[PDB]
């Protein structure tokens, strides 16, 4: 298929989640192609590993393109300790790491 | 703990190219080897046993090849729907074991 | 009986 | 593992987007067992751009998901999003209303 | 035609026991014989154990032996498999199939048969 490049998106922890004490920051990864690509996580630029799963779609129907889930999960304390949470993607189709993100408090 | 080692895990072609699965076995297991098509959630449908026999109802673009540990299966050029995961199978030592292999990816390119 | 049938008590 | 409804919470997308195009939203589906999860998005008259990702195993034992569609940034503010959530397992039925927000 | 149908799947403890059935239909049960394979979520496939037409010889696993049995009774067209200690590493879409046996040759054979089950989830957790 044509090499298409993902599309990013990082979406904050809700409300709701946090008020029960979780906090799950996801990065959506949309309509890529090749499948292979890689997602790193940054909390105040600081490498994370362990703390986070992914969820890979199987190939479309229509537009034979992958999407990719990455799930950050923090407590609701650990979480507050923090401002940047960042997602950084690397993937075929980009000509530089792509890194999406957001400060908690502002 | 008959091994059977599938090759490539995953692999991309177009629609109308050619391409080419391999099993290999730790044992001669003659031409007792069946290959196997899987599609997402769904059952593994049978498409090549003795090796080289088609199950009937498979196209004819479906071949297959090879005899004691090395195995071939070659399909001619490709369809839409030819895009799943394939198996290999051994039946040599049908009554006590029966073993399969990794299973390899066909994406669409 | 049919074949397939037979090579089963065989192989058993 | 303690068969569990899941709780369904808001992917929201931000009062800024792309200005003048094309926006992310949708919902976390988190802590449920056992599998399968259905999840549909306006009673199933949103189909297209709609991603159900396969569900992953955490550490407690519980299962979670995302169901992501893709929107137009102007129809945020006015067009309304609802995910419809089923598991049947736990017999649970939750439609979460996904809304803006800004910070 | 000729249909495998799985049920009793679900949830179970681990140390805890489980039993499945699988009712065939549409052809001579007692002409062939049954396998039960199983596949964990993202996986690929296993045998787990066989039972021959006259109910006499059984076959599992290695990775199931001690702890899985197999049985099926040709007047109800049903085989049955009694999972015994089960392990997390147990939780696996368990098919209920008839496989190719060797010996099967001329592709069109009506002796090839080999149809699958549509396959029931067993999920071990606590």
């Excluded at chain 2, 629609?15 to 290999?24: H, L």
């Excluded at chain 4, 609802?82 to 039925?93: A, G, M």
């Amino acid at each position: 298929r044509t090499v298409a490049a993902p599309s990013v998106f990082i979406f904050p922890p809700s409300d709701e989640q946090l008020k029960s004490g979780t906090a799950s920051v996801v990065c959506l990864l949309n309509n890529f192609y090749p499948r292979e690509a890689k997602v790193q996580w940054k909390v105040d630029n600081a490498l994370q590993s362990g703390n986070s799963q992914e969820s890979v779609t199987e190939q479309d129907s229509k537009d034979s393109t992958y999407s990719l889930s990455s799930t950050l999960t923090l407590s609701k304390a650990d979480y507050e300790k923090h401002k940047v949470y960042a997602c950084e993607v690397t993937h075929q189709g980009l000509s530089s790491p792509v890194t999406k993100s957001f400060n908690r408090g502002e | 703990d008959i091994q059977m080692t599938q090759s490539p895990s995953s692999m991309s072609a177009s629609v109308g190219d050619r391409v080419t699965i391999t099993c290999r076995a730790s044992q001669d297991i003659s031409k007792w080897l069946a290959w196997y098509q899987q599609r997402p959630g769904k059952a593994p449908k049978l498409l090549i046993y003795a090796a080289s026999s088609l199950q009937s109802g498979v196209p004819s673009r479906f071949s297959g090849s090879g005899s004691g540990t090395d195995f071939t299966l070659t399909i001619s050029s490709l369809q839409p729907e030819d895009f799943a995961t394939y198996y290999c199978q051994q039946a040599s030592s049908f009554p006590w074991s029966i073993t399969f292999g990794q299973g390899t990816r066909l994406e669409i390119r | 009986p049919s074949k397939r049938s037979f090579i089963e008590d065989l192989l058993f | 593992a303690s068969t569990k409804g899941p709780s369904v919470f808001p992917l929201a997308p931000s009062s800024k987007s792309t200005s003048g195009g094309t926006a992310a939203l949708g919902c976390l589906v988190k802590d449920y067992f056992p599998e399968p999860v259905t999840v549909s998005w306006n009673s199933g008259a949103l189909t297209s751009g709609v991603h159900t990702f396969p569900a992953v195993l955490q550490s407690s034992g519980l299962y979670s998901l995302s169901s992501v569609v893709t929107v137009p940034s102007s129809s945020l503010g006015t067009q309304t999003y609802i995910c419809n959530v089923n598991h049947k397992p736990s017999n649970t039925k939750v439609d979460k209303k996904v809304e803006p927000k800004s910070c | 035609q000729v249909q495998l149908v799985e049920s009793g799947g679900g949830v179970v403890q681990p140390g805890r026991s489980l039993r499945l059935s699988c009712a065939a239909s549409g052809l001579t049960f007692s002409g062939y014989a049954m396998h039960w394979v199983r596949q964990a979520p993202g996986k690929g496939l296993e045998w787990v154990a066989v039972i021959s037409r006259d109910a006499r010889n059984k076959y599992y696993a290695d990775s199931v032996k001690g702890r899985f049995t197999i049985s099926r009774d040709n007047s109800k067209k049903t085989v049955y498999l009694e999972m015994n200690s089960l392990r997390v590493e147990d939780t696996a879409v368990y098919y209920c199939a008839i496989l190719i046996i060797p010996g099967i040759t001329e592709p069109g054979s009506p002796d090839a048969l080999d149809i699958w089950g549509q396959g029931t989830m067993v999920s071990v957790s606590s």
